[PDB]
């Protein structure tokens, strides 16, 4: 349960190392009940031992925050995956090597 | 593949669900072999049909993406899952329905 920003996200995602939880409330007047979400989001983040990691959307990141990672509405919960290197082939190697070492990189993505 | 750099490689790969394979040259003095790779590139790509998706690296942007997603030799390949919305849960619902949803989009990322 950390706010975060347009400035603060994309590390904080980034670098989680568990799937995020954003939480976008809204105001109290218009969306009085998203305060209801932010007291069950922590308890939602504990029934998934060491999946999941919460932030709270700042207000004035809400557009671009929303635009970005596909919320229509608020309050909502967007629950965000975050970039993984799959691997890194270094140097110059041969064709059947790059085939065999990508398949195998797009086969744990398959079935993990 | 087309050149990327830091402030263009995010909007590039957005909304392409497939994996991103990331070129790194180098510099032709110190990574001549790196126009090898190059060449073997979009055959790898096209490959693995629907999967994948290439970008090169502009020079500037090498430093600051080798970083960004744990490259330490050129010339390479990195391989990346990009960062994406699982879901979104919009508006208050009840416990047993959060629990629900997040648990299939969990139940989906460990066996697609």
């Given at each position: 349960?950390?706010?975060v ?6 590390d904080?995602?980034?670098?989680s190392?568990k ?10 007047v ?11 989001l ?15 959307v ?6 671009g925050?929303?635009a970005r990672?596909?919320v229509?509405?608020?309050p ?17 190697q041969?064709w ?11 086969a744990?993505?398959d079935?993990p």
């Amino acid at each position: 349960p950390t706010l975060v920003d347009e400035a603060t996200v994309d590390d904080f995602i980034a670098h989680s190392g568990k799937i995020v939880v954003l939480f976008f409330r809204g105001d109290a007047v218009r969306f009085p009940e998203a305060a209801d979400l932010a007291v069950v989001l922590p308890e939602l983040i504990n029934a998934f031992p060491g999946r999941l990691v919460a932030a709270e959307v700042a207000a004035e990141a809400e557009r671009g925050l929303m635009a970005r990672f596909g919320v229509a509405v608020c309050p909502s919960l967007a629950v965000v995956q975050p970039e993984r290197t799959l691997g890194v082939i270094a140097k110059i190697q041969d064709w059947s090597s790059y085939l065999a070492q990508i398949g195998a990189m797009l086969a744990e993505v398959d079935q993990p």
